[PDB]
């Protein structure tokens, strides 16, 4: 009813970055991923793979010590900050990162919020997902804050019940992005990308193959990596959400939508991204 | 001699569910898999992969603590109930599941039967396989109980010797499904699917590539996932058994039947399922 | 100079077994693999994959406790006898196996020889490889003993120096198979398969892609599995050696011979075996 | 400005080795890889895969004890020297190796330099990378020393700031290869391969897909393996750098350059190498 525009293929093609011959990994930046706990380990692998697939230069995974050995054989290109998400509860980060994500596979605790508060004093874009999503406010800072809730997490954040939210998704997402002064990626069919400056878009890609555990962890990583290779973080978010959906669409050409596993979205992205170049 | 009908391709096509665009993982439900022990760990990975491939929304694996790290790198989309199958011996489940499977890679012990008794107080379909199969009776409850014995396990359950069973497979399977008031999937060439209401079918798919360790663990998971995406649990069982066999048939087109590994059935299912859509 | 015949494609085609529809995993038997130590773990994975790919019904891997978790994610279809190769030093096996292999990734110790002595009291074919190969004699027993030395191991076994061996490979292999009353698979280009009854063949397949660590561990497993699905153990050995080589030849059609990894031979076998059916 | 020639396809084709039918793994030699620490484990897997893909006969990985289990499931063909890189700080090597690499995933410490000093008393080519790169001099010895710095590591080695280095890359690389009497592979677009005898080449292959963590670890392993199968170590270095780049070029034919993971370069090398045969 607000006639929110779709972020279309033309917009993706016009905004995806080049990876020029005169580049080194420093050009594409170091991301930090604060994810994975002994109790929810897989989220770190999913987000890690998403991030490294998505154009960053280096990835540091601040996961629980016992999760590290589960990532290495699948993603030997990542490096680690041992118990990083826990350590971040106690002190500001000393290292400079191009972008930070926090939350996948983390519990919904006060200590995770202390880590969030410390990460927000860095000067870079920050993504909050999953256990890092809470009812709270955000400090004025350098760099966007990007929240990636599903409708239940949106309810947790705002008190808008899911059954009311789903009637006016873009209207609520826009209202709350403005109130919180954060980007809100409100997941679902026609995911809403609402910006604090009032810009808002709908995502046209994806299908029900995505309605399964782990696909949002993969998306968080994709956003994290795209923030490292796009100069404009708005375009990084929009392109990540778009390409994530497009990977599910490629899957369903020859595979049943009931059968996708989230990690495969990362495996598909190389060929899908090429098509938009 | 009872002229039991085959569950044919036409029946599969008519009964497989859609995965609509307006869906979220909640629509497709959360399964619980109680499987894998330090001594038989692989069954949990096989059943877990089968289940997540088969249309569920979320999977919780209640496996032994030491088995968790063996699953994560292969199936990072699963989450865990640490020592769940052991914990279930002591108390009713507090969480609501769309469907439950118990037994793959579990020992044939009294404690496993205590877990079975507790799981049966939930209101959902329950599958019993492998170490959860015993000579016993079943309480009247909400939701079907689905037993998946090979002939040796059927003997354990009923006292019908294997050499007598194999002469009259459907007759015995039907008699015992009625007596126990459980679904019985009696494995073998022309697997029998006998329902407590007296309906009975034969499975027409599969071949000797399936006669190797682990393929039944994969089937248990497939049934578990299909119970989450079919409204009619009878159709979930029949389609799982059918599609499982059809994956072996696709394998033998270009691969020797001596060489299949069970996990590959899960890897094949995406393309096989698409063909029946 | 002895004009030893090649075991040709025609012989392979004529002797490979069917996997009929009326089969269960019991038909194809349970193999035991005693392999892998904390210090040489990979051999157990290589031999395990080879064996399960090669037509057995079930595989029990008696490996060191710390090696088990390294196998599971890659070969979840195997089951385990925890510290089996060590336990076998102390007592006769209580379980019946269709075939047994011992040695890959095991140290060349007296305790490994005690395990060999205990395994030889079983009534089944037994393969000795790697650390199980020693200068020794063999008891009269039911079932063939199959030794799989490379030339250096042959020297260890017999005192024939490698430089003399390599001049008269089939003559030495035949002489020693007769003296020991064991099958000897003497590895190398034109691997020699010498039988204690004086039959002897050369293998015509393979290439230098096989001249890299691990390819013999894969072969041991292939022999183990083929012993489970062939009625004639002589044919199992000959076909395993043949098909192993044929997998390397398929690799070199589109890949450099310098670049093969042994586990890939197992991955290739499904398609190669189909061609000989 | 020095008109440094490219090491071209013609030069690669003319210098790559055969793998003849009359070969055994001994012909192709045993490499030692001293890499991977609890804090940087992935480098050992990347370099290990690179090395085993690159024509060696055997690989021993002297990595930290806790890293071993992370390598095995992916590279079961490798064997181990438990805590080898640490042990090498204390004593000369007792075993003979065809080639040695040290440094990927190792900290920049004095103990790593003690290991380097001990490895240099062996008579074989030695590669120093990553944490093994330091400001130092090198003893006259049998066998080349090959340093593989990125520009920041070159600065660490020489005191030439990166912004000055990048203006005159070949001039600085040549000057320092001569001064140190080491081979210097100075990474970047148009990687420089400078020899202590004053020969110098530019690498013409590669693209920005390589500007991501781990691709240099993969290169170190590729050089290590190629040193084992080339008689001329100069040609081994040049061909490794060339083929490494060529793998990235093959990737970008159908995949976005933003999306490559380093381990995939190893997976691509089999087909790329075949093309140059
Ligand atoms: N029907 C559908 N059509 C298009 N996209 C759909 C979808 N269902 C879910 N998603 C998409 O799947 C992801 C779930 O993240 P989540 O965080 O809820 O999942 P987890 O990883 O389990 O956390 C989102 O990107 C969502 O838009
Ligand atoms: N010859 C054959 N034709 C068609 N299907 C065959 C078969 N042999 C076994 N199965 C099929 O393989 C699975 C074994 O489960 P299992 O529980 O005995 O195997 P495990 O996983 O080892 O337990 C069943 O689905 C069975 O019908
Ligand atoms: N040039 C060649 N042509 C054909 N086959 C060749 C070969 N080189 C080695 N093999 C073949 O590779 C395996 C090595 O086992 P191995 O036990 O020496 O290897 P490991 O697994 O390292 O023990 C044997 O089958 C041998 O015939
Ligand atoms: N733009 C580019 N064009 C061609 N090659 C490029 C490149 N960027 C990096 N590399 C190539 O990537 C590797 C990085 O090793 P590194 O040691 O800096 O990377 P790490 O493994 O992270 O250590 C080198 O081979 C370099 O030439
Ligand atoms: Mg989520
Ligand atoms: Mg079973
Ligand atoms: Mg051997
Ligand atoms: Mg480096």
UniProtKB/Swiss-Prot annotation, chains A, B, C, D:
GO terms for molecular function: ADP-dependent NAD(P)H-hydrate dehydratase activity; ATP binding; NAD(P)HX epimerase activity. Residues 8-276 form the YjeF C-terminal domain. (6S)-NADPHX binds at residues 43, 105, 150, 217. It catalyses: (6S)-NADHX + ADP = AMP + phosphate + NADH + H(+); (6S)-NADPHX + ADP = AMP + phosphate + NADPH + H(+). GO terms for biological process: metabolite repair; nicotinamide nucleotide metabolic process. InterPro entries: Carbohydrate_kinase_pred_CS, CARKD, Ribokinase-like. AMP binds at residues 187-191, 216. Pfam families: Carb_kinase (PF01256). It is an enzyme of class 4 (lyase). Homotetramer. Belongs to the NnrD/CARKD family. This is ADP-dependent (S)-NAD(P)H-hydrate dehydratase. It comes from Bacillus subtilis (strain 168). The lineage of its organism: Bacteria, Bacillati, Bacillota, Bacilli, Bacillales.
């Amino acid at each position: 009813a607000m006639n929110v525009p779709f972020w279309t293929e033309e917009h993706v093609r016009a905004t995806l970055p080049e990876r020029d011959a005169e580049s080194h990994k420093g050009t594409y930046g170091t991301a930090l991923l604060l994810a994975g706990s002994d109790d929810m380990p897989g989220a770190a692998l999913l987000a890690g793979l998403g991030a490294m697939r998505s154009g960053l230069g280096k990835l540091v995974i601040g996961t629980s010590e016992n999760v590290i050995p589960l990532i290495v054989p699948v993603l030997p290109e990542a490096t680690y900050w041992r118990d990083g998400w826990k350590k971040a509860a106690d002190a500001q980060l000393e290292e400079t990162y191009r972008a930070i994500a926090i939350g996948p596979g983390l519990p919904q605790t006060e200590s995770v919020q202390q880590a969030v508060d410390h990460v927000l004093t860095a000067d870079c874009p920050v993504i909050l997902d999953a256990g890092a999503l809470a009812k709270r406010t955000y400090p004025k800072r350098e760099g966007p804050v990007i929240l990636t809730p599903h409708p239940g997490e949106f309810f947790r954040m705002t008190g808008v019940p899911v059954n009311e939210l789903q009637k006016k998704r873009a209207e609520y997402a826009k209202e709350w992005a403005a109130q919180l002064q954060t980007v809100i990626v409100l997941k679902g069919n026609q995911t809403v990308i609402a910006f604090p400056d009032g810009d808002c878009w709908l995502n046209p890609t994806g299908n029900g193959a995505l309605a399964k555990g782990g696909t949002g962890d993969t998306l968080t990583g994709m956003i994290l990596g795209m923030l490292c290779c796009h100069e404009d973080p708005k375009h990084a978010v929009l392109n990540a959400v778009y390409l994530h959906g497009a990977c599910a669409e490629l899957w369903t050409d020859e595979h049943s939508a009931h059968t996708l596993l989230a990690h495969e979205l990362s495996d598909i992205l190389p060929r899908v991204w090429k098509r938009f170049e």
